Every structure is written in structure tokens, then in C-alpha cells.
Amino acid sequence: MLGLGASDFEFGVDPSADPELALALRVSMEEQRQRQEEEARRAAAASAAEAGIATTGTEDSDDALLKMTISQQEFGRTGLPDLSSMTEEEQIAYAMQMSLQGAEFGQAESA
């Protein structure tokens, strides 16, 4: 035939054409990292007890201020459509929800 070009492969070759397939392969790689980190960190903790966490006292307050301050700030007040709490994907989750699930206008201009 006289084909062979940018037609036989337009979905299973370039992820830029479909972010659903590009995100699917990104979710699989992230899973392998969870098992490689949860297991890599478990071995780092058992070894830290020998020559890593050798301290007789208490010094776990610096992160408590980072977690306690962000735990109530990141998830505390929600009685308003705040934007600082929504990241670039969280804000996108709201902006994209209106683009597909927010066409409540009538019959003048809608996509």
C-alpha cells in the first residue's frame, strides 16, 4: 500500500496524544517505587538502630511543628472555596469538573 506514516500508530506510540495512557504508565511506575521505598526504608531503620538513631533523649519536635501546623492548615477550615488549599491538580480537579460537569447555562453557549 502507500500508507505507512502518522496513521498506523496514533495512540499506542505517542503518549502526548492521550494523557490517559501516559498517566496509566506513570501510576504503575509509582507503585514499584512504593515497594522499593517501603522496603528500602525498612532496612534503613533496622540499621539506624545500630549506628543511626543512637541518642538518649528526645528531639522529635521540629517535624511536629511542621506536621501539626500543616495538619490543621492543610485540612482545618473548609467553609469557603479557598484556592491556597488546592494544589495545581486539586484546583484543576475543580476547574476540570466545571468544564465537563459544569455546563449548567441553557441554550446560548456550552461545550
Binding site: G12, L21, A24, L25, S28
Partner: protein
């Protein structure tokens, strides 16, 4: 068997199936539970799309297996 299917919204569905079930049958199960059409639902596992004629055993799938669901669109 009870397998789980994760979607692109941090949501996983639990469907009871078997190793001799066809991928097309699984897609029909997610369509009746959610409503999405099967021709659009794409079952990808370990970074590989599954065929509709093949079953879950052809891809070495067991119970509590998490599959990656995707949406096919010919527009953008």
C-alpha cells in the same frame, strides 16, 4: 475471585470474577456498576493493555489484583 480496578480518580472498584473470565466481561461489569462504556474502558496491567478476547488468566492475574483502568477517546 475478587479483583480490584483502580481508575484515574484515586478510586478502585472491587469486582468478583474468575481466572477464566474474558476482559470484555470485566469491562461490562464496570460499565453496569459505574456506567462507562466497555469499548472505552481500557484494562492495563504491569504496563500492558489486555485484549478483549483474552481472559484474566492469560495475563497471570490472581485475586486482590489491582488493574489500571484507562479511558480511550478519539478527540483529545
Amino acid at each position: 475471585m475478587q479483583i480490584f480496578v483502580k481508575t484515574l480518580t484515586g478510586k478502585t472498584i472491587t469486582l468478583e470474577v474468575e481466572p477464566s473470565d474474558t476482559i470484555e466481561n470485566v469491562k461490562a461489569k464496570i460499565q453496569d456498576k459505574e456506567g462507562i462504556p466497555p469499548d472505552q474502558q481500557r484494562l492495563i496491567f504491569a504496563g500492558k493493555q489486555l485484549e478483549d478476547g483474552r481472559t484474566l488468566s492469560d495475563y497471570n492475574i490472581q485475586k486482590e489484583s489491582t488493574l489500571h483502568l484507562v479511558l480511550r477517546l478519539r478527540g483529545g
